[PDB]
């Protein structure tokens, strides 16, 4: 069965490369050395009508929409996914996409800031934290997560499987048929265990540490949805992309 697990790993890696433009390898090549830096209002304007914090938030929303599209195309590649009840496919995407967004965002981050506009720019962490309340608090938890997540030193081949494991989560609210989802996830987990033990002999308990990050991701997502509720009321000027609205509705 090890050959079947390696074949699954390779299939997922190939699909990941096909689906996601700015991979961790490409990001890390940029981040280690050139992007323009956004670190203040002036550089923002040179980098680039509504208030500054809102303009940035709207930018983040459009990037998320592109990510939902890419993640969904990836999901379709996971063997068995499109043979699930379609209601459950939709539920898995609804609840999975944000977890995956924040996982993959860590690839674009270091402790000092985040790559933007396909790796052509870098927005400082300090600048994002400086934004007027409550916008100053959107990205900071993500940076805190990313610093801890990036300390695992995962590569793209590892991430491809981990993201599939997240999508095939049988504990999502509203699933109709949990057992076939868990059957797929069990195979994915076996593939991830093998991939990590192969690729990272220096860290025998990496599998454990990585899976424990799923708890972190869910907390980040919970907190994010809460900050949107706040914004929803008083920011009559924010405008939520209609796709993201679909995801957030009754989440």
């Amino acid at each position: 069965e090890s050959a079947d697990l390696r074949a699954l790993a390779k299939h997922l890696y190939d699909s990941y490369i096909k689906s996601f433009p700015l991979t961790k390898a490409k990001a890390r090549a940029i981040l280690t050395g050139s992007p323009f830096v956004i670190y203040d209002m002036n550089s923002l304007m040179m980098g680039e009508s509504k208030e500054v914090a809102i303009r940035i938030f709207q930018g983040c929303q459009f990037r998320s929409v592109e990510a939902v599209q890419e993640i969904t195309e990836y999901a379709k590649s996971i063997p068995g996914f499109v043979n699930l009840d379609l209601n459950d496919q939709v539920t898995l995407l609804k609840y999975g996409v944000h977890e995956i967004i924040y996982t993959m965002l860590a690839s674009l981050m270091n402790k000092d800031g985040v790559l933007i506009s396909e790796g052509q720019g870098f927005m400082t962490r300090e600048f994002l934290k400086s934004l007027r309340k409550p916008f100053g608090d959107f990205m900071e938890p993500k940076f805190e997560f990313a610093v801890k997540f990036n300390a695992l030193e995962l590569d793209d081949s590892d991430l491809a499987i981990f993201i599939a494991v997240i999508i095939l989560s049988g504990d999502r609210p509203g699933l109709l048929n949990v057992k076939p989802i868990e059957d797929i996830q069990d195979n994915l987990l076996q593939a991830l265990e093998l991939q990590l033990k192969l690729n990272h002999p220096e860290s025998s308990q990496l599998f454990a540490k990585l899976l424990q990050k799923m708890t972190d991701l869910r907390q980040i997502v919970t907190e994010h949805v809460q900050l949107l509720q706040v914004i929803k009321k008083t920011e009559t000027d924010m405008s939520l992309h209609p796709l993201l609205q679909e995801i957030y509705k009754d989440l």
Binding site: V68, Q69, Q89, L243, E246
Partner: peptide
Amino acid sequence: XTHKRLXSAXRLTXILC
């Protein structure tokens, strides 16, 4: 294809399907 929540997931379903 169609599913129970088609009307409230029209954009996500366009992507998937």
